[PDB]
């Protein structure tokens, strides 16, 4: 359970489809990245805290096409999807701001 890793680009849409109509929060990450590391535990706790939404993790180098088509310019970057459509975005390791926007979507 928890934060689900997307191992390569073709596995990404399946994940977006498999979220059904649930909110999907995708954390775009990469290796040797301090803020990425700082936020990781919190993100994992958020998924524990919100089992009604789906939490995913994409490494921008394992999933280049996904990073590029989502116009990812820095990490960590969180994208928000509902029914496979990107509806929001949040950059950074400020966990408070992140959970506040997740809550605003769980509306």
């Amino acid at each position: 359970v928890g934060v689900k890793p997307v191992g390569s680009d073709p596995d990404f849409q399946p994940e977006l489809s498999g979220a059904g109509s649930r909110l999907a929060v995708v954390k775009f990450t990469m290796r040797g990245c301090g803020p990425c590391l700082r936020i990781a535990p919190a993100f994992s706790s958020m998924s524990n805290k919100y089992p009604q939404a789906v939490f995913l993790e994409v490494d921008v180098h394992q999933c280049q096409g996904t990073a590029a088509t989502n116009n990812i310019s820095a990490t960590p970057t969180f994208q928000f999807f509902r029914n496979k459509v990107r509806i929001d975005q949040y950059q950074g390791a400020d966990a408070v701001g992140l959970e506040e926007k997740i809550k605003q979507h769980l509306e």
Side-chain angles (χ1 to χ4, degrees):
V1 283
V3 183
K4 210 310 196 191
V6 183
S8 64
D9 292 325
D11 298 328
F12 188 66
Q13 289 310 319
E15 286 303 321
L16 252 37
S17 208
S21 80
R22 291 181 290 180
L23 179 70
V25 193
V26 180
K27 174 184 63 163
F28 285 82
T29 197
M30 75 181 168
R31 290 299 347 278
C33 165
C36 304
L37 183 73
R38 275 161 237 149
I39 195 49
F43 192 54
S44 186
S45 284
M46 285 183 210
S47 73
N48 299 329
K49 192 174 170 188
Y50 299 111
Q52 67 271 48
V54 320
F55 295 63
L56 310 180
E57 186 178 311
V58 175
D59 175 297
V60 305
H61 301 120
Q62 291 166 190
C63 300
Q64 283 184 55
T66 307
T69 57
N70 276 280
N71 188 60
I72 302 292
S73 58
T75 57
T77 293
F78 299 85
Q79 307 278 73
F80 296 68
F81 299 81
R82 250 190 245 128
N83 297 191
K84 308 181 294 181
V85 179
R86 185 216 277 197
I87 61 150
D88 217 341
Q89 78 78 242
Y90 179 97
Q91 278 188 357
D94 165 2
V96 180
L98 180 56
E99 175 166 1
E100 281 3 292
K101 285 190 55 68
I102 293 173
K103 285 182 185 177
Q104 73 179 55
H105 281 100
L106 291 170
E107 58 180 316

